[PDB]
């Protein structure tokens, strides 16, 4: 449960990642990959990439990115009421890739690490606590699919 005014700052730190979309997406990726690299595993398409300079240089993660921060920009849009784009991530990442919660707790902090490595001073408590808010409401709601799903 955000207020309008913490849904406006969510949505004026997402301005900073929408004029770079994939450039925030790849770093957030490299960042969930070198950090919790059995992440990398469930990816079928990027377990080869050994080095964080083969992920650096992967075209198709960059293009990943741009999907994972799109899809996530079209449910941040929504101020919560996502059912409907929510729906189908938690049930793509339940049933087909099998992503536990954990990793997506793994990439929002991420987001939030990429957030202040790319904009560092430019991403001020106020924005850092909504944006957080906004990747536990996220997080909670796929959470609450899990369950449905008995998926751990
Ligand atoms: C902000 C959180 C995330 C968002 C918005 C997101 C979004 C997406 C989208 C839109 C797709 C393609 C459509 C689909 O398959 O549903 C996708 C695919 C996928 N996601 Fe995520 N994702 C997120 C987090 C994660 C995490 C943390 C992992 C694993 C650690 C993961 C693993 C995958 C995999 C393995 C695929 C299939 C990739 C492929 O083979 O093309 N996702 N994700």
Same mark, same amino acid.
């Given at each position: 449960? /955000?207020? *309008?005014?913490?849904?406006?700052?969510?949505?004026?730190?997402? @301005?900073?990642?929408?004029?770079? +979309?994939?450039?925030?997406?790849?770093?957030?990726? +490299?960042?969930?990959?070198?950090? &919790?690299?059995?992440?990398?595993?469930?990816?079928?398409?990027?377990? =080869?990439?050994?080095?964080?300079? $083969?992920?650096?240089? !992967?075209?198709?993660?960059? %293009? &990943?990115?741009?999907?994972?921060?799109?899809?996530? @920009?079209?449910? /941040?849009?929504?101020?919560?009421? &996502? #059912?409907? $784009?929510?729906?189908?991530?938690?049930? !793509? =990442?339940?049933?087909?890739?099998?992503?536990? +919660? %954990?990793?997506? #707790?793994?990439?929002? *902090?991420?987001?939030?690490?990429?957030?202040? !490595?790319? &904009?560092? @001073? *430019?991403?001020?408590? *106020?924005?850092?606590?909504?944006?957080?808010?906004?990747?536990?409401?996220?997080?909670?709601?796929?959470?609450?699919?899990?369950? $449905? /799903?008995?998926?751990?």
């Amino acid at each position: 449960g /955000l207020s *309008d005014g913490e849904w406006q700052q969510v949505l004026n730190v997402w @301005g900073k990642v929408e004029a770079d +979309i994939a450039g925030h997406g790849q770093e957030v990726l +490299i960042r969930l990959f070198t950090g &919790h690299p059995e992440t990398l595993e469930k990816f079928d398409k990027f377990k =080869h990439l050994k080095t964080e300079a $083969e992920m650096k240089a !992967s075209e198709d993660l960059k %293009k &990943h990115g741009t999907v994972v921060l799109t899809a996530l @920009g079209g449910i /941040l849009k929504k101020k919560g009421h &996502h #059912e409907a $784009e929510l729906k189908p991530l938690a049930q !793509s =990442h339940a049933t087909k890739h099998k992503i536990p +919660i %954990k990793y997506l #707790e793994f990439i929002s *902090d991420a987001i939030i690490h990429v957030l202040h !490595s790319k &904009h560092p @001073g *430019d991403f001020g408590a *106020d924005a850092q606590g909504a944006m957080t808010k906004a990747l536990e409401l996220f997080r909670n709601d796929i959470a609450a699919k899990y369950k $449905e /799903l008995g998926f751990q």
